[model samples]
Target: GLLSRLRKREPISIYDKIGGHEAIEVVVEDFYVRVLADDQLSAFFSGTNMSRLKGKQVEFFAAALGGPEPYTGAPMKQVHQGRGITMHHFSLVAGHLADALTAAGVPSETITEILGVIAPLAVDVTSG
Candidate 1:
């Protein structure tokens, strides 16, 4: 369960070692481009401004991954609070993310590792 534990570790944000702010800019940009094109999850991103959203994702993940940056966005559940998010929606989002990472040439193993860190957030990210 070591791998699972590592995936579940608190403050698992990915902003560090990846070059901080600049690196996150790339990650968020790449990730959302895929999300926007994904029919299954596009609705969630509909009202969002891609560029601004990317910035927030970078900031949020930066903090979540243990970076020095502070996340000012709404909490996971609060952000999706009344959006009617479901488990299937969450799964689709994750799958789309994986696909995006693959498209971005992130190693398959690293994608799995990154998702490990993100998976545990599903509870708060989904609506029943």
Candidate 2:
């Protein structure tokens, strides 16, 4: 009983809090669903890449949240390699992500934590 109880109290992943794999799927889609749906975003953003990019977002969102699997994807270069997506784009991206989480009923702290995870990564694009 003690051993099992100890294991039970161990930390859960984002998957657990989001009600497992099924739930997070919708969350990931909504994130990009509206992200690209923005006409303003479309001014500089390409359309229709979500068919593949959504998959990448899902992989990392799960992997970053301490799930059993690793993200195991290639680093992004297309993002700002030539497009010069700087902090301006990063802010828009983060803001859109926050809104998506809010729409999904995630608590502020959880959204903040997820944003923190993405914040550092934005620096690479800022260099562009």
Candidate 3:
């Protein structure tokens, strides 16, 4: 009972509240499914290693949500450099992420928080 009490007393992060690694995996996979279905976005993924991308995305989201894992993926600006990504593409991706989170049954408040976290990355992700 002592261990149970300690566990209950421990503070959980937004990551844990949203279901942690499994949730991140589900959200990323669903987001990619939506992205790949859109012609505008599909071209960007051509010849890309999807498995590796998904792994990095999982880590990125996990870290962004205050999970235990640290994000080791390339910096957003560096990754987007020369990719021709524009504000429209970024908006589409963000919408996909929001939809994925909603489909996963995440609370709207939590989804808003997650969106807020990533909102600042638009400049880094878009070429212009």
Candidate 4:
């Protein structure tokens, strides 16, 4: 079974540690629910395509977390170039992402490492 396979593997990517696609899928869904309901973050995504938005999120996480998928979306900077995103907004979003990962039962240190991947993105995703 998968547990035996995991036991055999011993060590794996941060992607594998977080349980890859299944975990990523639920994390994004949980993250999206929070972000979309929040007042500040919702404005940026107003009228934005939901499926595409989630797909890009999945790609972003997949790449950052060391999944088999490559990111094919626009550069984070380019994607946020005109959206006027800021550190405060990014922090709020990041915080919600943290919550989502936690809700998915990701381990504390694993979530920390995952956030480490996006920590540098504060600048790239910010317009101000």
Clashing pairs in 3: none
The pairs that clash in candidate 4 are none
Q: lDDT: which is higher, 1 or 2?
A: 1
Comparing 1 and 4 by lDDT, which wins? 4
Which stretch of 10 consecutive residues in model 2 shows the poorest summed lDDT? Answer: 1-10
Each model's TM-score, in the order given?
0.75, 0.78, 0.88, 0.88
Model 1 agreement with the true structure over 1-128: per-residue lDDT tens digits: 22454587844344444345665566677777777787878888778777766667888876765566777777788787788888888887888777766765667887787788888998888878
Ranking by TM-score: 4, 3, 2, 1
lDDT of each: 0.72, 0.70, 0.88, 0.85
Residues 43-84, model 2: lDDT tens digits: 555644666766776777777765544565567664556666
With candidate 2 superimposed using the best TM-score fit, by how many Å does residue 101's alpha carbon deviate from the native?
0.7
Give the candidate number with the greatest lDDT.
3
Ranked candidates, highest lDDT first: 3, 4, 1, 2
Candidate 4 lDDT by residue in tens digits, 1-128: 34565788855778778887888889999999999999989988898999998998898888788777778788887788878888899999999999998988888998899889998988888887
Runs of candidate 4 with Cα error greater than 4 angstroms are: 1-11
Q: lDDT tens string, model 3, 8-60?
A: 89666778888878899999999999999989899999989999999999999
> Model 4: which ten-residue window has the lowest total lDDT?
1-10
State the lDDT at 52 in candidate 3: 94
Alpha carbon deviation, residue 63, candidate 1 (Å)? 2.1
